[PDB]
Amino acid sequence: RIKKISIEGNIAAGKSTFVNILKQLSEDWEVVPEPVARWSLTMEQKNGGNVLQMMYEKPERWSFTFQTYACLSRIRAQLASLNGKLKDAEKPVLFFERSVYSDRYIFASNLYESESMNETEWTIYQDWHDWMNNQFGQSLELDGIIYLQATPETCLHRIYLRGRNEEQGIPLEYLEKLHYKHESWLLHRTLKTNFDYLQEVPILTLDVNEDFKDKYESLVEKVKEFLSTL
Amino acid sequence: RIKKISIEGNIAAGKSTFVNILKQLSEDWEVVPEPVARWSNTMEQKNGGNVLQMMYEKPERWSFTFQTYACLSRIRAQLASLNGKLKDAEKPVLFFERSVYSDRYIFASNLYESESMNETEWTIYQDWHDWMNNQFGQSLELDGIIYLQATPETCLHRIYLRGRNEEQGIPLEYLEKLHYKHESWLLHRTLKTNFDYLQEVPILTLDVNEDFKDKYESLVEKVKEFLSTL
Ligand SMILES: CCCc1sc(-c2ccc(OC)c(OCCNS(C)(=O)=O)c2)nc1CSc1nc(N)cc(N)n1
Numbered sequence: 107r108i109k110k111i112s113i114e115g116n117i118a119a120g121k122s123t124f125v126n127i128l129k130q131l132s133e134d135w136e137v138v139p140e141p142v143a144r145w146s147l148t149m150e151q152k153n154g155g156n157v158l159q160m161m162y163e164k165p166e167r168w169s170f171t172f173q174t175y176a177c178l179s180r181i182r183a184q185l186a187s188l189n190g191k192l193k194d195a196e197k198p199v200l201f202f203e204r205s206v207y208s209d210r211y212i213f214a215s216n217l218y219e220s221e222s223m224n225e226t227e228w229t230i231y232q233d234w235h236d237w238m239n240n241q242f243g244q245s246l247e248l249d250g251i252i253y254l255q256a257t258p259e260t261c262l263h264r265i266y267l268r269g270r271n272e273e274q275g276i277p278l279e280y281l282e283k284l285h286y287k288h289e290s291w292l293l294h295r296t297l298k299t300n301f302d303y304l305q306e307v308p309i310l311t312l313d314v315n316e317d318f319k320d321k322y323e324s325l326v327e328k329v330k331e332f333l334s335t336l
Numbered sequence: 337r338i339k340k341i342s343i344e345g346n347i348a349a350g351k352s353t354f355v356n357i358l359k360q361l362s363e364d365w366e367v368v369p370e371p372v373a374r375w376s377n378t379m380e381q382k383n384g385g386n387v388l389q390m391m392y393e394k395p396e397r398w399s400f401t402f403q404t405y406a407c408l409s410r411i412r413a414q415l416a417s418l419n420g421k422l423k424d425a426e427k428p429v430l431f432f433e434r435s436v437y438s439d440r441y442i443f444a445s446n447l448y449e450s451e452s453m454n455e456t457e458w459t460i461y462q463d464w465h466d467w468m469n470n471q472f473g474q475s476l477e478l479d480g481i482i483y484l485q486a487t488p489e490t491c492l493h494r495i496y497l498r499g500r501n502e503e504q505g506i507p508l509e510y511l512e513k514l515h516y517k518h519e520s521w522l523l524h525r526t527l528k529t530n531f532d533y534l535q536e537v538p539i540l541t542l543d544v545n546e547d548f549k550d551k552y553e554s555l556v557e558k559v560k561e562f563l564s565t566l
Pocket residue numbers: 117140142143146161162163165173176177208209210213214220222276277279280
């Protein structure tokens with residue numbers, strides 16, 4: 107009976123900011139952080155610690171490997187929040203920091219289109235992704251999507267505006283791709299998929315364009331109004 | 337209810353011929369051929385030819401991707417049989433051409449030791465393999481193993497007989513290490529895997545150096561006798 111809601115958005119757009127806020131507003135709300143973030147000392151970390159630097163260091167060698175690991179690690183954290191967090195809340199909501207579809211339809215896709223993965227690497231990844239995401243068939247299935255919307259430029263601010271040694275090289279151009287991949291997926295809804303419920307899940311667009319850090323109340327109101335609809 | 341037996345042995349031990357021979361003998365007797373062996377000869381088959389072909393040219397680049405895809409293809413292909421085949425035979429037995437256990441502890445373990453997977457790939461694969469098998473491959477658990485123990489030169493000769501222009505190389509030295517790792521897991525029973533039960537799991541081991549595609553009644557008498565103590 108748990109609602110599962112993915113919060114989408116570009117690098118350093120504020121997804122984690124938002125989910126950190128939402129978690130403390132209700133004791134019936136919990137957050138699943140995205141693993142690549144914790145990567146960015148268990149065996150998942152060193153590995154993702156390793157695979158992330160290796161990806162940065164050379165993407166067209168390491169993208170498949172990185173992509174497959176990011177997603178399995180996501181599929182395992184989300185399974186372990188639903189089966190752990192929140193036992194009998196009246197109104198339980200689980201907020202996911204991104205989803206298995208951002209893994210593929212935004213990130214995996216982009217690397218394929220950036221020629222950082224070949225057709226065999228991309229078809230294999232999809233095969234792996236699609237046969238598996240048809241195994242769980244309604245467990246991880248989303249109830250709603252919330253899209254934090256920044257400009258690649260708002261996002262670019264915040265990437266520097268944000269502290270991680272390794273991230274300092276991310277150039278503007280990486281972002282406009284993901285943005286159009288984001289805008290085209292979650293608004294214009296051109297981008298099609300092989301998950302026969304995703305073209306009917308509803309979406310909440312949210313201008314994180316104005317700083318919303320000590321002025322988060324009306325965003326949170328839209329979220330509450332949205333939840334009531336679902 | 338459906339009994340699962342793994343057929344294990346070095347490349348060209350004679351697994352595909354023994355298993356083809358066995359399946360003719362009984363309507364209770366069914367088979368799951370190895371995905372890899374099928375690729376040598378459908379998008380999976382489109383993917384499978386290419387990465388195998390890639391894995392010959394540059395094992396050091398392609399072993400993670402090959403080992404992940406080989407194992408994924410076996411699981412799903414063992415599941416399809418398990419979910420459908422033998423629903424009611426009276427005494428159903430499915431013979432697997434190799435297993436997720438050889439995927440990992442012969443071929444991947446060897447690929448890494450010989451430095452075609454670096455350390456991180458091998459740890460990721462091992463993590464992938466634990467979770468992929470626990471979530472999806474559970475009901476594939478083995479009732480026993482038929483280890484078709486042979487020797488190196490036999491196989492080279494048999495590779496030649498088959499005429500497979502890709503393998504006709506394979507260093508007698510590479511046939512010689514794959515050969516050595518099967519003893520440890522199966523012959524001496526030393527290798528403790530990550531899956532505890534196998535330690536108990538009954539193993540039959542047959543010497544098959546001699547041409548058998550005419551004479552195997554003794555090979556089959558020991559199967560039948562093995563299967564009944566199960
Ligand atoms: C934000 C830290 C993760 C990284 S690192 C990275 C990267 C690093 C170096 C790259 O090339 C030099 C690269 O892309 C190749 C070309 N793009 S570029 C930098 O404009 O020339 C991507 N992409 C990414 C995003 S891939 C990703 N996949 C997921 N499945 C989830 C997720 N959160 N992120």
